Structures are given as structure tokens and as C-alpha cells.
Amino acid sequence: ITPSYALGKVLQDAAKIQKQQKDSFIAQDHILFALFNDSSIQQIFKEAQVDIEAIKQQALELR
Amino acid sequence: ITPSYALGKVLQDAAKIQKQQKDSFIAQDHILFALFNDSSIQQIFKEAQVDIEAIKQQALELR
């Protein structure tokens, strides 16, 4: 029915990343940053992806 | 005093655009592509251009 605001934020954030990273189309890595920024593991002990600094490290090492 | 982070980035991005198009020198056309990647006008509801999709086509629409 909807992408919700949950993805309005993620998908649009990926677009924001594109300006930061200088390219007209959303890279899989840019959408990965957006996903990772909003992603979480909803358990009693919150778990999460390595923070964005490592994600960026790898996003810079690869391509 | 400064060109802002914004023109620093736009003028250098225009060089990046040369590289995407395989052009020898920065064109005014390239500056416009760089501006599309970084075009955002401060407002509550900000104005902006499409990152780059339309301008690639619009470059073809020039002689």
C-alpha cells in the first residue's frame, strides 16, 4: 500500500548520499548507507551493523 | 574570502563530469552538471535539480 515514511526516509537518504558522493544515480552502496543508518536488530539487547565509519571505509576501499 | 564548500566541489565536480564524458576541458555544460549534483536552495521546502539524470539528456538536446 505504501513505502511508508520509513522508506521515504531511506530511499530519499540514498539520494542525499548521491550529492555527497558526486553521482547522478543511486549507487547500491549509497542505498546501503541509508539502510544501515536506519537498520537495527530489534532484540532485548539491541544489535546493529558496524557504524557508518566502517561502512564508509569499505565503501571507499571498494570502488 | 571563500568559494564555499559548494563551489569548491562544483568546479572540481565539473572536472569529474569531463571525465564522465571524456572531455578535454571543463565546459559550461559541465558546470551545469556539477550544479545539478549539488543544486539545493535553502528554504523550508528546498528547491533542487534532479541529481544528474535530466541533464545527461539535456546535454544531448544542445547542438
From Swiss-Prot, chains A, B:
Superkingdom assignment: Eukaryota
Entry's induction text: By heat stress dependent on the heat shock transcription factor HSF1 and the general stress transcription factors MSN2 and MSN4. Expressed at a higher level in respiring cells than in fermenting cells. Expressed in stationary phase cells and spores (at protein level).
Annotated stretches, region: Repeat 2: 3-63
Localization per record: Cytoplasm; Nucleus
Function noted in UniProt: Required, in concert with Hsp40 (YDJ1) and Hsp70 (SSA1) and small Hsps (HSP26), for the dissociation, resolubilization and refolding of aggregates of damaged proteins after heat or other environmental stresses. Extracts proteins from aggregates by unfolding and threading them in an ATP-dependent process through the axial channel of the protein hexamer, after which they can be refolded by components of the Hsp70/Hsp40 chaperone system. Substrate binding is ATP-dependent, and release of bound polypeptide is triggered by ATP hydrolysis.
Domain characteristics, as noted in the entry: Has 2 AAA ATPase type nucleotide-binding domains (NBDs) per monomer, a low-affinity, high-turnover site (NBD1) and a high-affinity site (NBD2) with a 300-fold slower rate of hydrolysis. There is allosteric regulation between the 2 sites. ATP binding to NBD1 triggers binding of polypeptides and stimulates ATP hydrolysis at NBD2. Nucleotide binding to NBD2 is crucial for oligomerization.
Quaternary state and interactors: Homohexamer, forming a ring with a central pore. The hexamer is stabilized by high protein concentrations and by ADP or ATP. Oligomerization influences ATP hydrolysis activity at NBD2. Interacts with YDJ1. Interacts (via C-terminal DDLD tetrapeptide) with CNS1, CPR7 and STI1 (via TPR repeats); under respiratory growth conditions.
Miscellaneous comment text of the record: Present with 32800 molecules/cell in log phase SD medium.
Membership in a protein family: Belongs to the ClpA/ClpB family.
Name of the protein: Heat shock protein 104
Organism: Saccharomyces cerevisiae (strain ATCC 204508 / S288c) (Baker's yeast)
This protein's encoding gene: HSP104
